[model samples]
Target: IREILKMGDERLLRIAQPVPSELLGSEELQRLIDDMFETMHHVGGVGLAAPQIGVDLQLVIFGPAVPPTILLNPRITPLDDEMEEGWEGCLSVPGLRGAVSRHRRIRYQGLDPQGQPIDRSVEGFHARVVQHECDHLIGRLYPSRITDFSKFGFTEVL
Candidate 1:
């Protein structure tokens, strides 16, 4: 039987230790992708990283659709130094949300489903989502990046 995993439990925050090269190309990667999507969707999230779901790899998944758009070993290049403050939340940190600064635009490079390199630039909400998910893979959370934690509030974006 397939084991079901829940979000935000202590097990979910273990800080994935990273996968070796051999495991990256195996069925385990596929399972990780599936489990992550199931967990994210069940928890009503737009995107999630392996680390956030308790798996360690430079992998991410995001999309409004059933089958999430996955990013393997994703990288981001900023298009402009300019950025804007945006509201953010996390499944890992429940019942809490905050406004945080992020790039207004970005270029991302990563492998597609077949493991081919695909690069593209996105702006606005989509760009912000990518940046937020990428931050998870590198051991970052939304609140950690907030410059003015004192001003953060659930009522509005300050």
Candidate 2:
């Protein structure tokens, strides 16, 4: 399994480049995503981004019950103006949760690892997860979006 880059890792601070369409479905892409899946499972996380594993590519995989969907070059559209603060954590950040603000609902569209088109409208927990994963692609962690430090702390104590 690949190592998840910690918050202090400068590689995680770089904005990821979009995965070229030509690279989708290649064996290398498949292998890297395989490692990502294994690492995320090993580290016990709901989702993971390429940058989190020190890959500067706009790629992410979210956990089941959808069976780890790939969301490369993802695009998000807020369905409403409403913002919700939800408790969030990251595999890269590790052991900490924060009240991060996210859109209440959204429509996410992207290409799967197989080059298949994927689009979905989701809300609540799913929305939070989507936003959090996308944030990594832009070099933004959940901690940077926290407005109230009192609402953020170690997951076990929170």
Candidate 3:
């Protein structure tokens, strides 16, 4: 199993390198993707980013709750100006949850595992999950996005 790095791990703080476009569909890439999905499912998380597993690449896998999608070097655009606050948790930040704000809707585009392009605009929890996972690529965690400290705490208390 790929180890999920904790909040303070320096590897998680570095801005991740993008997955080389040429690496898509290669054997090693597929193996890493499998490891990531396995780690995510084993931890019961809706989304997982490569950086969380200490792989410094801009790769993210998410869903089964919304739509199953894989992204590499993703680009996101907000479709709505409004921000929505919701409960968010991370596999890396185990046992903690926070109320973080994210765009109400977004359009995301990136290459798939097979080197094909994927583009979609989504809202609600789907968009939230996408944003959450994308943050890891930029060296950020949900705690830094919290506007309401009162709503940030351990899962048992939140």
Candidate 4:
């Protein structure tokens, strides 16, 4: 079992490398899936990535429940129209948040935790979270999504 990395870990800063389909079925990958689920739930997050725990792999897990989704080498297909700005919070960037614009609808293609191919369409907040976390897997942060810095705020809990 791998260690559950906390916020501020240097591993959180590096961009994750993409995971091939072959490694998707490995024992380490399975353990990482379990650890990622535990981390997201323990931290009350709707999404989490391997990079957040210092594993630089293009893998992400998310869900509103257990049996969390595993997105390997995921890619987004934006809808015809642009989405509106919405409030967003991150487990890494704690306390700080902003209203970022994103696609209202999107289609994602990736491999499941068991290495099964899957494609799913998501919309609204769910779509936003998926896109946001996907960006994290590639080493992007939400602050970059902010259009106007002055409008962003820090909330202890909102």
Candidate 5:
């Protein structure tokens, strides 16, 4: 499995590049997706971005019960003005759980692992998961969005 980049990793701070259309179904991309899922599951994360494993591509895989899914070059737009604060943890930022505010609902679109189109309107934890994972593609992490430091601490403390 690929090693998940940690909080201070400089590579994690760089923006991820979009995957070229031709490489969408390439064996290497598929293997990377598989490895991402394995790494995310092994680390007990609900989602993972390609950059987290040092691959500078706008790829993310998430979901626990819903079956891990792959999203390439995801674009998320808030469905409404409503916002919600939720506790979140990251595999890269291990041990920290932060209360981060996010849109309660969103409309997200992207390419699937096989290069097909994918579009969805979702809310609650699923929406939150998407936003969080996508943030990595732009070099943002959960801790960076935490508003109140008092609400951020070790996961075990929450």
Candidate 6:
């Protein structure tokens, strides 16, 4: 499994590059996806991005359930004006948790490992997870989204 980058890594603060279409389903890409899932589960994370593992690709994997789903070159659109605040933590920012406000529903589109198109609308925790993971792709951490610093604290204390 690939090593998850820690909070202080400078690389985590830069935008990731989109995966080349020709390399989408290559063995190396598949291996990276598999390893990302392994690393995520091992660290008790529900979501992870390629940049979290030191890769510059616009890839992310997230699920509140088993068999996490992959998203390459994902685009998220809010479905409504509604928003909700929820506690969120990340593999890259271990031991920290923050209450962040996110769209209550979203429509997301991306490519699968096989490079096939994928699009779906999601809400609640599912939407939150997707937004959180995608944030990493743009160099935004969960803490950066926290509107109230008072709502940010150590995971054990939060």
RMSD per model, one decimal: 4.1, 1.5, 1.1, 2.8, 1.3, 1.4
**Model 2 per-residue lDDT at 6:** 88
Query: Using TM-score as the measure, which candidate wins?
Result: 3
Candidate 3 TM-score to native: 0.96
Candidate 4 stretches with Cα past 4 Å from truth are 1-10, 64-67
lDDT of each: 0.73, 0.87, 0.91, 0.78, 0.89, 0.89
Query: TM-score, each model?
Result: 0.80, 0.93, 0.96, 0.85, 0.95, 0.94
Q: Which residue runs does candidate 2 get wrong by more than 4 Å?
A: 64-67
Go through the candidates in order and give the clash count of each: 0, 0, 0, 0, 0, 0
Give the Å shift of residue 55 in candidate 1. 0.9
Better candidate by TM-score, 2 or 5: 5
lDDT of 3 by residue, 109-140 (tens): 99998889889998989999989999999999
Expressed as tens digits, the lDDT of each residue in 103-124 for candidate 6 is 9999999999889998999899
Compared with the true structure, what per-residue lDDT tens digits does model 2 show for residues 1-158?
Answer: 88778889999889899999889889999998888889888878888999987899999998625446889999999999999887887777778988878899999999998789889998888888889899899899988999989999988898
Say which candidate scores most in lDDT: 3
List candidate 5 stretches off by more than 4 Å.
64-67
Q: Write the per-residue lDDT of candidate 1 for residues 18-120, one digit (tens) a residue.
A: 4455655578788887888788778778988777655667788898222358877777999999898877887766666787888998999988655677688
> Model 3 segments beyond 4 Å from truth?
none
* Candidate 3: Cα lDDT at 2: 83
Ranking by TM-score: 3, 5, 6, 2, 4, 1
Residue 135 accuracy (lDDT) in model 1: 82
